[PDB]
Structure 1
Amino acid sequence: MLDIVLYEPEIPQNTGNIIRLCANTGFRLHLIEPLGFTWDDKRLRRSGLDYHEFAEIKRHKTFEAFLESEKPKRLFALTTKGCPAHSQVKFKLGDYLMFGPETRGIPMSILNEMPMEQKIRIPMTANSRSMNLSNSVAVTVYEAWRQLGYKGAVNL
């Protein structure tokens, strides 16, 4: 129902799980290059992923190109540096949710241009460790989907 954006994702397997998440939820996926793997890589293609789950994906050469072609109504950034939790904001149609690489956050230069209200974080207890990108994305997507009533969902 919304658009999800991977800022320079690095690991093939995470992106494959996110591609599956997006196809299972109706969320549209975007990837901001450089990616840490070729689009043709085998750890992704043979991840057991079905090719129908692809080509709803958009690749962008830069973050500025992405902004230019998508002109997101509101862009959110999942960052350990955000204050409101991911479930503490009210998502809406037109929202784009952006995620950083699995080994570093979304650049400060980008984050510095977003209002504090759109820099969100997944809660964690004291002295936690980084959560896997795909788990982060799954959590955020399902929470935004929950808020929007799971439109498109259907049973077994």
Structure 2
Amino acid sequence: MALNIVLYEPEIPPNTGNIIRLCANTGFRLHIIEPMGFAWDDKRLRRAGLDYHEFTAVTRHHDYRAFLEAENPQRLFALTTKGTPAHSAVSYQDGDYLMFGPETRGLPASILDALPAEQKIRIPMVPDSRSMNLSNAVSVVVYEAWRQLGYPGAV
């Protein structure tokens, strides 16, 4: 199984820590587009108690263009409140990359405009909802994609 999570300029250490654990638990690979809002050395990152092996799921990319050149994503989805289909209304498949913006801002227009409407997904919410925690949102999208594929690799 090849499913990928992409974090664009993540800002808050414990969110990234949680998402690393999430990838380790699901077999998803993690891609980080620099710069991050914190150092890898940050004490808040590994409060998670992350093992050495868990970091082998993580690849760093200097910028978005470098990410595209290294990974050549076959399909790139972006989570955005501006999206149209629900995260569960699309059909994920091997090779997909699922991209998320920073905790305090959306993904840049220059990226969002490169994607067709059907690849910009949104997590359903009640009217007048507030922002969801980023690691929560990634967990929801990841587990929904993994569900659709029948949880390959799970015990």
TM-score of the superposed pair, with normalisation by structure 2: 0.97
- Corresponding residue number in structure 2 for 1:50: 51
Q: Which position in structure 2 is the counterpart of 1:113?
A: 114
Q: Root-mean-square deviation (CA), in Å?
A: 0.8
* Alignment correspondent of 1:144: 145
**What count of residue pairs does the alignment treat as equivalent?**
154
Match of 1:77 in 2: 78
Compute the displacement of 1:40 (Å). 2.0
Residues 10-54 of structure 1 deviation map (CA, whole Å, 9 limit, x = unaligned) = 000000000000000000000000001112222113332222111
Counterparts in 2 of 1:7-156, with a 5 A limit?
7-154=8-155
**Unaligned segments of structure 2, at least 5 residues:** none
| Structure 1 residue ranges, 4+ long, deviating more than 6 angstroms after superposition | none
- Secondary structure at 1:83 match in 2: coil
What residue identity is the alignment partner of 2:59?
Answer: K
SS of residue matched to 1:117: helix
Q: Which amino acid in structure 1 is aligned with residue 56 of structure 2?
A: A
Instruction: Verify the 8 A CA contact 2:5 2:28 in the aligned structure 1.
Output: yes
Secondary structure of the structure 1 residue equivalent to 2:78: strand
Q: Distance in 1 between matches of 2:14 and 2:40?
A: 12
Q: Deviations over 1:46-104 (max 9, x none)?
A: 33222211122000000000000000000000000100000000000010000000000
In structure 1, C-alpha distance between the alignment counterparts of 2:83 and 2:25, rounded to whole Å: 27
Displacement after TM superposition at 1:134 (Å): 0.2
Say if 2:23 and 2:57, in contact at 8 Å, map to a contact too.
Answer: no
- Deviation of residue 119 (structure 1)? 0.3
Q: CA–CA distance in 2 between the matches of 1:30 and 1:57?
A: 6
Report which stretch shifted further, 36-45 or 60-69: 36-45
Does the 8 Å CA contact 2:20/2:57 hold for their aligned counterparts? no
2: CA distance between counterparts of 1:116 and 1:49? 36
SS of the aligned residue for 2:57 comes to coil
Distance in structure 2 (CA, Å) of the matches to 1:101 and 1:117: 21
Distance (whole Å) between structure 2 residues aligned to residue 90 and residue 109 of structure 1? 25
| Native 8 Å contact 2:31 2:58 kept in 1 | yes
The unaligned stretches of length 5 or more in structure 1 are none
Identical pairs, percent:
77
